[PDB]
DNA sequence: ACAGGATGTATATATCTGACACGTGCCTGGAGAC
DNA sequence: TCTCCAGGCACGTGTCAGATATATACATCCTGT
């Protein structure tokens, strides 16, 4: 409840770690653009929701997705 | 200041058993060595039972003390069984024993 | 007298349940300090702009 | 398949190997109430009192089965009979 | 206030038809406020404030509670999570045995997760519902799950689905979803396997779902482009790679593809 | 203030088996066992005090009662440990 | 008697509840002097 | 018998053990063809 609030409010936070489905489902992450996938190759359905939590309405800049 | 249990080097209480001896109407006069002697005897008996119970619980490869281990420790030991040959146990079971001719 | 006591007990239970629900809803729904510097029994050499000091023992 | 006598040893090992209760609870509770209302009617009972009665009759019955099986081997037999039970009750002391 | 108004009007049209609908679009355009507008429109139309059920993954349970409080605060919000004593207290909170329409009641919205609903199948067997919503319903894609069995035994007869991607294509979740929408005549999956293959599947599910895409409105969202970064293995990583290749499962490959310290 | 021996046998279990826990039914077994031993030894000491026209219970009566109740190896170890505890307590100087 | 489609296994993860643990406020019986 | 204080109990807060899943192959087993 409050980690997402502290992410969206504070601008000095830099790195937001995540698992696959822990925060890639319905969490508003419009304050960032660059999603970086370490080993997200499990299924396209899981990854299609993964940047859906970030590339959402309210983003004010370009989104650069890096797949490693 | 400090309690009599540390004065006699024990962990069981001394004033508690002195109180329980006092109004337990066993006699109207009670000496000073009576609670420390009873305390030391209870110390040794609880320590022996806990030793055998811990050995049986470790023997089960299971990290708690379950009354099956208490039953195993009570009946495996010789004179602990002699002391406790009257008392029935709660949730303990029966030691495995088959008479020799029933094996074919 | 029993019915009024039962109604008071039901009202107290409902008030306790509502207070528990309200409490559950209201309660559930940096710069880092410097290293410690110590100097005991040690002579001090001190140097300002205009004068120098030497606090010896 | 198994010969008659090996699976009996398997289940006797399983019954000696465990610690669960072997008497159904509700017939025992009904029996306790129906055997207590003659002494005193409209009685109330505690659940752990029923558990104490359970474990007492379990220990009494299994000890009774030890010494009646000892009566069975003493008469050069395997199956227990009623005279083995009467002998065990007499040699225990009670009537 | 968007183009989901005609979509919710069409959903109300199939609701007036008397059968369940399908929403098969990705998250991002506001399916949540669309569902709360569906609830508001049906509460204004048929005048119902009563039994509404919500099953959602727990990461966004508090989130959709939050936007329910921020968007439409006229209803009564009651949660369902935590310890068993709080579960009993909340069970007491809707233990009034209410039926049909109610106005002054605390069960206006009821929010829970999949797994303790699966754990409390005896408690959810009673209290027959009027409208239930499943959000992110890709997790019951297998027909052999016990959660599917507990989700096949309700008394609500309304199967609105909120799924970003129901096109998982494992030959059985399609039959699972069409058996979920119509629970009466879809039962023998061998016959539906029996009943040119690329074209002929277009018209089967067409009147149930609707086709929407992200590239129909103005796009200041970011326009996500891909950078696939490639790099060669180190000598240590290739060394243990050839070592466990010689000793010989895919996760053993990928965990030494990630770090030798694994 | 319902009174029980739980803490004391918790520590004397903890000085020899640190990574071991007690069940509550077992907890009750040790509590009832300690109380039964206390009752048996104390009523035998009172009987032996009433034996000899004596109105006082001292350590000698409890030593005789311990030698009467326990089997032999337990008896000799119990009187050895109790005598050591009594001599520890008496020489508090 | 063999092939084909069912579960079984493995080896990692992941989320999530259950049945134990530990920690704290505060009274009455233990300790001391006599 | 008087004074007294802290050890010990009533009642709170966390921690892994266990259960349950997902997924990508191979492996194997059981049955029908």
UniProtKB/Swiss-Prot annotation, chain A:
Taxonomic placement: Eukaryota, Fungi, Dikarya, Ascomycota, Saccharomycotina
Written domain comment of the UniProt record: The DBINO region is involved in binding to DNA.
Cellular location(s): Nucleus
Species whose genome carries this gene: Saccharomyces cerevisiae (strain ATCC 204508 / S288c) (Baker's yeast)
Identification of the protein by name: Chromatin-remodeling ATPase INO80
Note: Present with 1110 molecules/cell in log phase SD medium.
Residues represented out of the complete protein: 1355 to 1422 of 1489
Entry similarity comment: Belongs to the SNF2/RAD54 helicase family.
Protein role: ATPase component of the INO80 complex which remodels chromatin by shifting nucleosomes and is involved in DNA repair. Its ability to induce transcription of some phosphate-responsive genes is modulated by inositol polyphosphates. The INO80 complex is involved in DNA repair by associating with 'Ser-129' phosphorylated H2A histones as a response to DNA damage.
Assembly mode: Component of the chromatin-remodeling INO80 complex, at least composed of ARP4, ARP5, ARP8, RVB1, RVB2, TAF14, NHP10, IES1, IES3, IES4, IES6, ACT1, IES2, IES5 and INO80.
Source superkingdom: Eukaryota
Curated annotation (Swiss-Prot), chain B:
Domain of life, per lineage: Eukaryota
Residues represented out of the complete protein: 16 to 119 of 132
A single MF term (Gene Ontology): protein heterodimerization activity
Induction trigger: Transcribed during late G1 and S-phase, repressed in G2.
Keyword Glycoprotein carried by entry: no
Compartments, as annotated in UniProt: Nucleus; Chromosome
Chain positions found as N5-methylglutamine: 91
Organism: Saccharomyces cerevisiae (strain ATCC 204508 / S288c) (Baker's yeast)
GO biological process: chromatin organization; DNA repair; heterochromatin formation; negative regulation of transcription by RNA polymerase II
Residues with the N6-succinyllysine modification: 7
A GO cellular-component term linked to this record: nucleus
Subunit text: The nucleosome is a histone octamer containing two molecules each of H2A, H2B, H3 and H4 assembled in one H3-H4 heterotetramer and two H2A-H2B heterodimers. The octamer wraps approximately 147 bp of DNA.
Posttranslational mods: Phosphorylated to form H2AS128ph (gamma-H2A) in response to DNA double-strand breaks (DSBs) generated by exogenous genotoxic agents and by stalled replication forks. Phosphorylation is dependent on the DNA damage checkpoint kinases MEC1/ATR and TEL1/ATM, spreads on either side of a detected DSB site and may mark the surrounding chromatin for recruitment of proteins required for DNA damage signaling and repair.
Comment field (misc): In contrast to vertebrates and insects, its C-terminus is not monoubiquitinated.
Protein name, as recorded: Histone H2A.1
Keywords: Acetylation, Chromosome, DNA damage, DNA repair, DNA-binding, Isopeptide bond, Methylation, Nucleosome core, Nucleus, Phosphoprotein, Ubl conjugation
Protein family according to the UniProt entry: Belongs to the histone H2A family.
Curated annotation (Swiss-Prot), chain D:
N6-methyllysine: residues bearing it: 40
N6-succinyllysine: modified positions: 40
Modified residues (N6,N6-dimethyllysine): 40
Modified residues (N6,N6,N6-trimethyllysine): 40
Compartments where located: Nucleus; Chromosome
N6-malonyllysine found at: 17
Modified residues (N6-propionyllysine): 17
Keyword annotations: Acetylation, Chromosome, DNA-binding, Methylation, Nucleosome core, Nucleus, Phosphoprotein
Keyword set includes Membrane: no
Additional comment: Present with 213000 molecules/cell in log phase SD medium.
Oligomeric form and interacting partners: The nucleosome is a histone octamer containing two molecules each of H2A, H2B, H3 and H4 assembled in one H3-H4 heterotetramer and two H2A-H2B heterodimers. The octamer wraps approximately 147 bp of DNA. Histone H3 is a component of the UAF (upstream activation factor) complex, which consists of UAF30, RRN5, RRN9, RRN10, and histones H3 and H4.
Protein name according to UniProt: Histone H3
Organism: Saccharomyces cerevisiae (strain ATCC 204508 / S288c)
Residues of the full protein shown: 41 to 135 of 136
Swiss-Prot record, chain F:
Residues recorded with modification N6,N6-dimethyllysine: 2
Chain positions of cross-link Glycyl lysine isopeptide (Lys-Gly) (interchain with G-Cter in ubiquitin): 88
Compartments it resides in: Nucleus; Chromosome
Any one GO biological process: negative regulation of transcription by RNA polymerase II
Function of the protein: Core component of nucleosome. Nucleosomes wrap and compact DNA into chromatin, limiting DNA accessibility to the cellular machineries which require DNA as a template. Histones thereby play a central role in transcription regulation, DNA repair, DNA replication and chromosomal stability. DNA accessibility is regulated via a complex set of post-translational modifications of histones, also called histone code, and nucleosome remodeling.
Family to which this protein belongs: Belongs to the histone H2B family.
Name listed for the protein in its UniProt record: Histone H2B.1
Organism: Saccharomyces cerevisiae (strain ATCC 204508 / S288c) (Baker's yeast)
Section covered of the full-length record: 37 to 129 of 131
């Amino acid at each position: 409840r409050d980690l997402v609030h502290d992410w969206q409010t504070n601008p000095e936070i830099f790195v937001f770690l995540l698992s696959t489905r822990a925060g890639g489902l319905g969490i508003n992450l419009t304050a960032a653009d660059t999603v970086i996938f370490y080993d997200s190759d499990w299924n396209p359905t899981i990854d299609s929701q993964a940047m859906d939590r970030a590339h959402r309405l309210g983003q004010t800049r370009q989104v650069t997705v890096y797949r490693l | 200041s400090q309690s009599r249990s540390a004065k006699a080097g024990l962990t069981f209480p001394v004033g508690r058993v002195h109180r329980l001896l006092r109004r337990g109407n066993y006699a109207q006069r009670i000496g000073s060595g009576a609670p420390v002697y009873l305390t030391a005897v209870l110390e040794y008996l609880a320590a022996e039972i806990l030793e055998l119970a811990g050995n049986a619980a470790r023997d089960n490869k299971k990290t708690r003390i379950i009354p099956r281990h208490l039953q195993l420790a009570i009946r495996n030991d010789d004179e602990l069984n002699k002391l406790l040959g009257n008392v029935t146990i709660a949730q303990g079971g029966v030691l495995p024993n088959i008479h020799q001719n029933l094996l074919p | 007298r029993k019915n009024l006591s039962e109604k008071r007990l039901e009202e107290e239970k409902q008030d306790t349940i509502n207070k528990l629900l309200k409490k559950r809803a209201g309660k559930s729904r940096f710069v880092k300090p410097r290293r410690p510097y110590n100097s005991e029994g040690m002579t001090r050499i001190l140097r300002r702009y205009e004068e120098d000091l030497f606090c010896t023992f | 398949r198994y010969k008659p006598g090996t699976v009996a040893l398997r289940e006797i090992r399983r019954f000696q190997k465990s610690t669960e209760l072997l008497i159904r609870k509700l017939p025992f509770q009904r029996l306790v109430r129906e055997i207590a209302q003659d002494f005193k009617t409209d009685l109330r009972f505690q659940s752990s009192a029923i558990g104490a009665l359970q474990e007492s009759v379990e220990a009494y019955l299994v000890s009774l089965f030890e010494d009646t099986n000892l009566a069975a081997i003493h008469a050069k037999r395997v199956t227990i009979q009623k005279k083995d039970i009467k002998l065990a009750r007499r040699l225990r002391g009670e009537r | 206030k968007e183009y989901q108004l005609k979509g919710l009007n069409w959903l109300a049209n199939l609701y007036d038809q008397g059968i369940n609908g399908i929403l098969a679009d990705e998250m991002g355009l506001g399916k949540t406020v669309q569902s709360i507008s569906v609830l508001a429109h049906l509460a204004e139309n048929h005048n119902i404030w009563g039994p509404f059920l919500v099953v959602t993954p727990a990461s966004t349970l508090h989130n959709w509670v939050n936007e329910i409080s921020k968007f439409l605060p006229q209803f009564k919000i009651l949660p369902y999570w935590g310890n068993a004593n709080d579960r009993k207290v909340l069970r007491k909170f809707w233990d009034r045995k209410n039926l049909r329409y109610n106005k002054n009641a605390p069960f206006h919205v009821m929010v829970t997760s999949y797994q303790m609903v699966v754990t409390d199948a005896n408690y959810l067997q009673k209290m027959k519902w009027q409208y239930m919503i499943l959000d992110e319903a890709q997790a019951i894609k297998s027909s052999q799950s016990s959660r599917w069995k507990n989700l096949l035994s309700f008394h609500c007869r309304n199967r609105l689905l909120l799924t970003g991607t129901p096109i998982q294509n494992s030959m059985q979740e399609l039959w699972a979803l069409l058996h979920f929408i119509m629970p009466s005549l879809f039962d023998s999956h061998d016959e539906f396997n029996e009943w040119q293959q690329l074209r002929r599947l277009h018209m089967i599910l067409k009147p149930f779902m609707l086709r929407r895409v992200k590239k129909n409105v103005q796009s200041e969202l970011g326009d996500k482009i891909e950078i696939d970064v490639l790099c060669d293995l180190t000598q240590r990583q290739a060394k243990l790679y050839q070592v466990l290749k010689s000793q010989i499962a895919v996760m053993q490959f990928r965990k030494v593809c990630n770090h030798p310290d694994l | 203030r319902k009174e029980t021996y739980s803490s004391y046998i918790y520590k004397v279990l903890k000085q020899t088996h640190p990574d071991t826990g007690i069940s509550q039914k077992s907890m009750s077994i040790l509590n009832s066992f300690v109380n039964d031993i206390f009752e048996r030894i104390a009523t035998e000491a009172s009987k032996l005090a009433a034996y000899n026209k004596k109105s006082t219970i001292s350590a000698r009566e409890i030593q005789t009662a311990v030698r009467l109740i326990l089997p032999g190896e337990l008896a000799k170890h119990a009187v050895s440990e109790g005598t050591r505890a009594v001599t520890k307590y008496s020489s508090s100087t």
